[PDB]
Amino acid sequence: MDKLLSSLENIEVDNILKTAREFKEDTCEEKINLSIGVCCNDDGDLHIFDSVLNADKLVTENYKEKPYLLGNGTEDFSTLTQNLIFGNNSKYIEDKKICTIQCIGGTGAIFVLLEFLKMLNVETLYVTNPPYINHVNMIESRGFNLKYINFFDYNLIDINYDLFLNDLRNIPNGSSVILQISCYNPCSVNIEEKYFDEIIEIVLHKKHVIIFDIAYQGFGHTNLEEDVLLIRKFEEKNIAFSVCQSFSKNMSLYGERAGALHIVCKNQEEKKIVFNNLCFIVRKFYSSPVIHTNRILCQLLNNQNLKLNWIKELSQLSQRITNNRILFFNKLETYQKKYNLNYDWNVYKKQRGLFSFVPLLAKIAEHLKTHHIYIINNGRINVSGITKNNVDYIADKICLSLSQI
Template sequence: MGIFENAGFEVKKYPYFSKEKFDVDFDAMYDFIATLPSQSIILLHPCCHNPTGADLSPEQWDRLTALLKEKGHIPFLDIAYQGMGKGFDEDAYAIRKMEAEGLSFIVSQSFSKIFSLYGERVGTLSVVCANKEEAKTVHSQLNGTIRKVYSNPPTFGATLIDIVLKDEELTKLWLSELEEMRARIQDMRSSLANEMKSLGIEEKEYSYITKQSGMFSFTNFSKETIIQLRENKGIYMVENGRICIAGLTKKNIPTVAAALKEAILIESSALV
């Protein structure tokens, strides 16, 4: 959001995550976007929502796409974890749906995680335009902006990705390794949920873990409880409640589950 604010845009937040349901509050999101002025830019995560891990279903994307088209909004799709959610193709559903419906939109894709090149800051910016003339104008504007901001970016990371994607066998290998990463994250989610179940924790307190997707889950713990977990148990998470599922291992899951149980008890006692 800071990027858009620094660029001079008026930024508003739309409702997305329901802390009561531990899921997307789609109706509230839809109704809010429906009230925005025509040609508003709407920032969206096609998959593996950060920080919540809660994604829209294909049916919800269909409804939202129809609304965006009707209102003339400009979707800005930020996709950093393609292949880490439901699958490489499945995670691109929103992008392909909007293209098929003839929307003009922007896609910002990061390769930091899915190519394990975090330090190289490699990504792409794609702008889907209504026609060739519009595309020429946008391309010219982008070239001018790039020239003023960074002119020529480092090429090392981009060259590595270029080598992989231009080679059929390397591409297959990369996709298979990405699928292994996705499967591991899902396994860690299931293992953590099963461990919490074995500790006698109510299902409603952990069922969100396996419903969410991607590297992160949203715990909804208070800042005070999160600080206690960090200082007393050595369990680290962002103070908004986001926990990194990718940081779990078979070895540390029992420790994490026990700490989460204690956190749940702390939160419950605070409500009494």
């Protein structure tokens, strides 16, 4: 007879779920969904490519057996995939200097890497303020010291590049740091090239260890190689680092949990070791990755007509989004007038990625629910869920709501 459940309390979850509850917990239709990590279609329902639907078909055509992955990934997976981050061709790729592995989405790659860091002398991790929430949970709940680096400027609404590089300069030495360089979650502010070179110099002097978080290649810009420039610049005049890569939004592969982990190694013989360490680590958890989601990925990425058909719809996507964001603040500059409010909404258009980040709205978050619109506690906003129909209602209620103070 299980009694263990006697000491069993219930838990407060992340901001991201108290709200997920709330969206689908009331009677009203015309409910609005602006908190979800997902990207919405024109019809306000989940997105999916055709390239991906075709990769799917392609996969159940070419494959009949379903083997365990030896493996922690394929050979095509680990080359096709790393093309996307390091481009082509690379000093690193064809010299077999990258050890890459298939994980369970970006989350899945982050966590194995953290498990891999406990493996070493890694007591402390730096994260840029404010940080992707789960990073906090994932880091902390395995007893690392979590420290914060200055980043987003809360009053200017841009990165504070002065204080960011400052901390980057007086934080020990060979400190381990997590960077979101593009499509920042939640900030939605990417690092301008103006500053790459200085960083490279700081990172070289301090010999820091960098972990790049790449969840949205192709949302910050029109060209998707742009979004990953710092990495490529880093590679030239070779520095070592790590990459957690998600395709949850890239390929619209949400539930498939498609992700990768890239670790840059000194020689063809360190690659071999780290690999065994990783396989080892993976075996006290789930032993191996999903073969289906491996196949779907190789098929798409490995075929030109699909890669090119996808990249296009992808390029066509970031456009619509950054456009939708422009439109949005323009409706707020307007409705604003009805309530005689005096806010500069122009400063949130600079922003890029799946969201916009309006700290000001943190104040109005629980009042925006009396009307049937849901938004994260901190100001973050799923832009992809604002239809041509939606703008008025939303923008109005934001102002209406704002004026009650």
